[PDB]
């Protein structure tokens, strides 16, 4: 357990954190989730990414910086979540995941709950620190 890194804004506090994790944990079972720092920059470039998840833990924290600066530059809602190991375990892996991607799918069984983080995170951006 490690705390997050002082770049790793914003940071979704607990019950936005748990929030998150549910939903990623049912886009990966719907397989409506891409993981990985690769990953999740491809669908931002296709645009099909509707929220950026990453770990604020993760080490070194350098390989998936670029995240924030892309997805502020195609106006895609993202946020860091405290801990790899958890978001690993939403995934549905025994590994830790340090980037996840939800994605596209205007007839998906949880486009509410998607929707419902995505103003969740945009309402956080709104309230101050970007990485421009
Ligand atoms: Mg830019």
Same mark, same amino acid.
């Given at each position: 357990m490690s705390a997050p890194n002082p770049? %790793?804004? @914003?940071l979704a506090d607990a019950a936005l954190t748990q929030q998150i994790l549910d939903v990623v944990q049912q886009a990966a079972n719907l397989r409506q989730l891409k993981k990985g720092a690769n990953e999740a920059t491809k669908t931002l470039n296709r645009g099909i990414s509707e929220f950026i998840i990453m770990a604020a833990?993760? $080490? @070194?924290? $350098?390989?998936?910086?670029?995240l924030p600066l892309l997805c502020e530059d195609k106006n895609v809602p993202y946020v860091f979540v405290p801990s790899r190991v958890a978001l690993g375990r939403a995934c549905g892996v025994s590994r830790p995941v340090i980037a996840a991607s939800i994605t596209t799918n205007d %007839?998906? %069984?949880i486009k509410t709950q998607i929707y419902a983080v995505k103003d969740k995170i945009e309402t956080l951006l709104i309230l101050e620190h970007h990485h421009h």
């Open positions: 770049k %790793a804004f @914003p833990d993760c $080490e @070194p924290i $350098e390989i998936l910086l670029h %007839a998906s %069984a």
